[PDB]
A paper describes a structure:
Junctional adhesion molecule-A (JAM-A) is an IgSF member that mediates cell-cell contacts and serves as a receptor for mammalian orthoreovirus (reovirus) and feline calicivirus. At the virion fivefold symmetry axes, the trimeric attachment protein, σ1, extends from pentameric turrets formed by the λ2 protein. The σ1 molecule is about 480 Å in length and composed of a filamentous N-terminal tail and a globular C-terminal head.
A T3D σ1 fragment comprising the head domain and one β-spiral of the tail (σ1H; residues 293–455) and the D1 domain of hJAM-A (D1; residues 28–129) were purified using glutathione S-transferase (GST)-affinity purification. The crystallographic asymmetric unit consists of two σ1H trimers, each bound to three D1 monomers. The crystallized complex consists of a σ1H trimer ligated by three D1 monomers. Each D1 monomer interacts with one σ1H monomer, making extensive contacts that shield a combined area (the sum of contact areas on both proteins) of 1622 Å2 from solvent. D1 residues involved in contact formation are located at the most membrane-distal (top) part of the domain and on the face that mediates homodimer formation. Reovirus σ1H engages JAM-A D1 using two main contact areas: a larger region centered at the D–E loop and its 310 helix, just below the β-barrel, and a smaller region formed by the top of the β-spiral and the α-helix. Contacts are largely polar, featuring numerous hydrogen bonds and two salt bridges.
Author numbering:
A (entry chain I), E (entry chain H), F (entry chain G): 28 to 129
B (entry chain C): 293 to 454
C (entry chain B): 295 to 454
D (entry chain A): 294 to 454
The structure:
């Protein structure tokens, strides 16, 4: 049984400031972390395979404990879902973090 | 076993090969989108997905579409439509996001203006995978004027990232 | 303490060559069907098993009338050369219905004549009781009495 | 040590060598058509991927001259491979026997300068001998022409080990 | 090598009775068992990969020591061949059992 | 880490005599040796996978220490390249030998 939860299930930070969404996971050996941004009707890929996508590469860095932004904007207010799958897909974890930019 | 690294794992006691590595079946119900020379349109589709060893196969069923340019791009949006436990990241090629001409194959498409379809032999291949969106190049085979296009069932494969 | 495909290779722990490359042959009957049209052909094809895949190299062959939508069936119940078993041609997805390995394949259609080639769509549809059924449809059609088929190699994940 | 490739040591534990799983390279050699007296060659740049026990040669699209109904397309791997690739690495598992492996349909445009008409031809890996892979290319049907446009084709087959 | 024989190389059982065709094999670790029915000049698949086929699933069960029928009819009089191949095909065994429905 | 060099980097032998081009390698466990003849622009395969090719099989034998000719002619003057790759291609060695048939 693997564990994947978040310490800060709901962040609220002022515009143009740095912020880290923490996804702390345990119980994996060969895990693949993946984050997806959610702004209502649209989903966007932020990070996949412990690697940040191109559309974000310039202002979001990865870490096994969460992704952190160089600076945020209202544009990024939404529900970020962090998914951690093991190798083989027999171990799966997931947790959503809610971001609110001001 | 503690000293075994996937795909090598414990099978019926003995050191064996993980079945999940050998065969892993899934599905994608997403959006395929054509584009090129200003022509744009999308279609919702249900395709099976098989992961055999280090390859990944996407069995696109046949589907219908609209006008298409001589040179175009067909994009599968894997950001959504995948079946848990599958992750969009799992659809990433071994050659990551470089631009390639992998799996080049011939594929016939029927083009019509409502009435009877005339089939064109076009060239298609895996061009590049970026941010969960697989883009296949579809060109060649000459062209004629039309408003509708009928596509065949195509299975797309390529080395999968690990 | 080793479970195939992991086995002993010259003292050390390696990979069984039988897993990597296994070559065989099938001399059986391919049978077309659909829209009342029926006919069969005896054929000699090579069979390669590479890793978890199985490849059936069907050589080119001639046939009769064919409907717009039809089924081509390879009967593996017989024709396999020892030590191959019909059960060794079972897909990893067992007998579910799929649309695996969909590919385009050109068939020449004539009335005895000068063959006119049709680009048709073909794929592994379903394997049941040692009989592999490939769906062959699309590409439009014309009236004919004879059909020339190309050499086609059919592949798919193999059951273990 | 006590591990025989492709089984190797992966971060302390017994794993699978990544070189076995994915190995990428390139070939910049000569493809040569032949058959019914027609002869011509073309220099080309293709990617090469080795995944597991397979080898894929991603031939880009190219232009050529007249072609017979039945012909042989030969990739000369004796040269053009990029280190550390060896011509011997391109040898099929079935060594140099004659086969009909990877048979597929491939459309070729034939023209006499003007507009191209595409033929659906049958192509497959026929035989590999002394670093030269020969693919058989026949059927379709055909017609008079002086130029031929080829599509990007990926050729695969069990690789020798 | 490996051994694959039968104790009852020839059964003779009245119609509508259950009957088991015994194929006892030894010397295999990862074997795949397969049975084929043979009535004259038409071969039919009974069992493959230690798994009974569909056309028989409803009245024939599998066992590492042979397949058994819920009930038989004269329709099934013939030469059933049991084949046991190892994994890799380096070990191969085979034996025929003749069924006669009285 | 692996070593592949030659003791005789330039041979000079009269026509119709036997000669051995030596390629001494060390550091390999499962090595595949390969020789290529070079005459200006025409490259020809001599040996591949510790096995002599067909076009040479009748007058050139292989050995882990180099290939030897039954008899040479001026036709064979050139730069013979010996390449030694390990299994997996992580270990690669190479050395050229120049032959001059006088």
């Amino acid at each position: 049984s693997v564990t994947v939860h978040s310490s800060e299930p709901e962040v609220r930070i002022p515009e143009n400031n740095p912020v880290k969404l923490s996804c702390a996971y345990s119980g994996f050996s060969s895990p693949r972390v993946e984050w997806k941004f959610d702004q209502g009707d649209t989903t966007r890929l932020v990070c996949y395979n412990n690697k940040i996508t191109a559309s974000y590469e310039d202002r979001v860095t990865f870490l096994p404990t969460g992704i952190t932004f160089k600076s945020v904007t209202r544009e990024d207010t939404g529900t970020y879902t962090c998914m951690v799958s093991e190798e083989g897909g027999n171990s799966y974890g997931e947790v959503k973090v809610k971001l609110i930019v001001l | 076993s503690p000293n075994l690294r996937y795909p090598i794992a414990d099978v019926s006691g003995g050191i064996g090969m993980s079945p999940n590595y050998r065969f892993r079946q899934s599905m994608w119900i997403g959006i395929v989108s054509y584009s090129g020379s200003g022509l744009n349109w999308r279609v919702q589709v249900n395709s099976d997905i098989f992961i055999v060893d280090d390859y990944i196969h996407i069995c696109l069923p046949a589907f219908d579409g609209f006008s298409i340019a001589d040179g175009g791009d067909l994009s599968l949006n894997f950001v959504t439509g995948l079946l848990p436990p599958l992750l969009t990241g799992d659809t990433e090629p071994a050659f990551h996001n470089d631009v390639v001409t992998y799996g080049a194959q011939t594929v016939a498409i029927g083009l019509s203006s409502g009435g009877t379809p005339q089939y064109m032999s076009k060239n298609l291949w895996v061009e590049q995978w970026q941010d969960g969106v697989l883009r296949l190049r579809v060109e060649g085979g000459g062209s004629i004027t039309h408003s509708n296009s009928k596509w065949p069932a195509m299975t797309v494969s390529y080395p999968r990232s690990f």
